[PDB]
Amino acid sequence: SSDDWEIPDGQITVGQRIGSGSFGTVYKGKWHGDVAVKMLNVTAPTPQQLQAFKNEVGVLRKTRHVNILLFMGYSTKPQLAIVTQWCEGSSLYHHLHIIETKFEMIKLIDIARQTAQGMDYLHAKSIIHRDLKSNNIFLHEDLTVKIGDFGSILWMAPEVIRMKNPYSFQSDVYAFGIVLYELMTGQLPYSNINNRDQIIFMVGRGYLSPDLSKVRSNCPKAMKRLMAECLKKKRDERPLFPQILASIELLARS
Ligand SMILES: Cc1ccc(C(=O)Nc2cccc(C(C)(C)C)c2)cc1-c1cc(N2CCOCC2)ncn1
């Protein structure tokens, strides 16, 4: 009945600082091989820092799926630390918008399917991501999708923009709809608008929505319809991940 999540003291080492996330700094480290370590820089944590650490461990520890970044364990001695697997590769954001990787349609649909697979797993455990975007979709060996929260108005559903509890399974679906747009256009939405306030205001008001005419010629019509359903302005009109997953599986077979 015990998962033995608490890593024994004096075992984790950290090397190169790769970034930051939530409560601390992210490093490439060692613990039974390469690992990523999210660690709080101070030895005396504030009650908020300790609470944020506890919440993150609490959600991560409930996940065991190939499309979810693998949580390996935690430590509180000498510092608060969360350990995950180490993946060679890059985020979907880095591929599409930084190095501009040209994926074949088959691979773009497969990346969509794997993301929907991981999202369906999270929602089944009542876990709302709250920040799904291409940056949080890691391409392990540039093939397998690993969803994480690695550190975002473009992916925000209109009701999340407008604002007490605007987050739901459907606001995650809307963010997935934007990811579908990124895969099918190779672009971020609203690239012809240079004003962030305007984007926030217009999306929240329903005056602005992604330009779906920008999707590639080889994008299946069923994918374009799914994307439109995921992006509905009214949250109750959006499909849930079991239906999204079933639609992607159907269009992939053609
Ligand atoms: C070290 C670490 C700890 C924790 C997390 C994290 O994803 N926490 C998290 C928080 C809220 C909700 C959720 C969900 C998914 C359940 C919705 C997850 C991410 C990292 C991490 C790993 C990393 N790697 C480098 C490349 O190789 C793979 C690992 N690079 C940056 N950061």
Tokens coding 136: 């949080």
Contact present, 188 and 196 (Cβ < 8 Å): no
Resolution as reported, in Å: 2.3
Task: Give the number of domains in the chain.
Answer: 2
Cα–Cα distances in angstroms (integers) from residue 194 to residues 53, 83, 135, 175, 190, in the given order? 36, 38, 21, 21, 8
Domain's final residue, options 58, 73, 88: 88
- Write b or e for each residue in 220-244: b if 16 or more Cβ atoms lie within 10 A of its Cβ, otherwise e: beebbebbebbbbeebeebbebeeb
Query: How does DSSP classify residue 22?
Result: T
Asked if residue 195 and residue 119 are part of one domain, the reply reads yes
Nearest residue (CA) to ligand 1, atom 21 = 150
**Sheet architecture: strand order including 81-85:** 13-21, 24-30, 34-39, 81-85, 71-75
Asked if residue 16 and residue 132 are part of one domain, the reply reads no
How many CA atoms does the CB half-sphere of 237 hold within 13 Å?
Answer: 11
Asked if residue 102 and residue 180 are part of one domain, the reply reads yes
Give the residues across from 82 on adjacent strands: 38, 74
Asked if residue 241 and residue 207 are part of one domain, the reply reads yes
Cα of 84 vs centre of ligand 1, distance in Å, is: 7
N residues, the chain: 254
Tokens coding 81: 């630390």
Contact present, 16 and 3 (Cβ < 8 Å): no
- In angstroms, the CA 120 to CA 118 distance is 5
Pairing status of strand 24-30 against strand 13-21: antiparallel
Task: Provide the experimental method for this PDB entry.
Answer: X-ray
**CATH number of the domain encompassing residue 156:** 1.10.510.10
Nearest residue (CA) to ligand 1, atom 17 = 129
Atom of ligand 1 nearest to the CA of 63: 16
Pairing status of strand 144-147 against strand 13-21: unpaired
Cα of 212 vs centre of ligand 1, distance in Å, is: 31
Cα of 85 vs centre of ligand 1, distance in Å, is: 9
Atom of ligand 1 nearest to the CA of 83: 1
Nearest residue (CA) to ligand 1, atom 2 = 38
Cα of 163 vs centre of ligand 1, distance in Å, is: 26
Tokens coding 49: 């820092």
Binding-site residue numbers for ATP are 18-26, 38
Contact present, 223 and 109 (Cβ < 8 Å): yes
Among residues 50, 42, 90, 44, which one has the least CA distance to residue 74? 50
Asked if residue 202 and residue 123 are part of one domain, the reply reads yes
Nearest residue (CA) to ligand 1, atom 32 = 150
Q: Residue 191, exposed/middle/buried by CB under 10 A (0-12, 13-18, 19+)?
A: exposed
- In angstroms, the CA 113 to CA 123 distance is 15
Q: Is 72 in the pocket of ligand 1 (CB under 6 A)?
A: no
Cα–Cα distances in angstroms (integers) from residue 63 to residues 40, 42, 67, 198, 217, in the given order? 22, 28, 10, 38, 37
For the chain, what is the total number of helices (H) and then of strands (E)? 8, 8
Q: Is 69 in the pocket of ligand 1 (CB under 6 A)?
A: yes
Helix 241-252 to helix 105-124 angle, to the nearest 10 degrees? Answer: 160
Domain's final residue, options 51, 73, 88: 88
**Collapsing DSSP states into helix, strand and coil, what is residue 118?**
helix
Asked if residue 125 and residue 30 are part of one domain, the reply reads no
Cα–Cα distances in angstroms (integers) from residue 73 to residues 76, 78, 129, 163, in the given order? 11, 15, 20, 35
Asked if residue 20 and residue 113 are part of one domain, the reply reads no
Q: Is 149 in the pocket of ligand 1 (CB under 6 A)?
A: yes
Cα of 125 vs centre of ligand 1, distance in Å, is: 18
**What DSSP string runs through 78-110?**
SS-EEEEE---EEEHHIIIIIS-----HHHHHH
- In angstroms, the CA 212 to CA 112 distance is 17
Amino acid at 26: V
Contact present, 193 and 148 (Cβ < 8 Å): no
Please give the residue range of the domain that contains residue 81. Answer: 1-88
Amino acid at 29: G
Cα–Cα distances in angstroms (integers) from residue 170 to residues 91, 107, 150, 157, 166, in the given order? 23, 25, 21, 9, 10
Domain's final residue, options 60, 88, 116: 88
Q: Is 36 in the pocket of ligand 1 (CB under 6 A)?
A: yes
Asked if residue 96 and residue 215 are part of one domain, the reply reads yes
Which residues form the catalytic set? 131
- Helical residues (DSSP H) of the chain, grouped into ranges: 47-60, 92-93, 105-124, 158-162, 169-185, 196-205, 221-230, 241-252
**Collapsing DSSP states into helix, strand and coil, what is residue 219?**
coil
Contact present, 69 and 138 (Cβ < 8 Å): yes
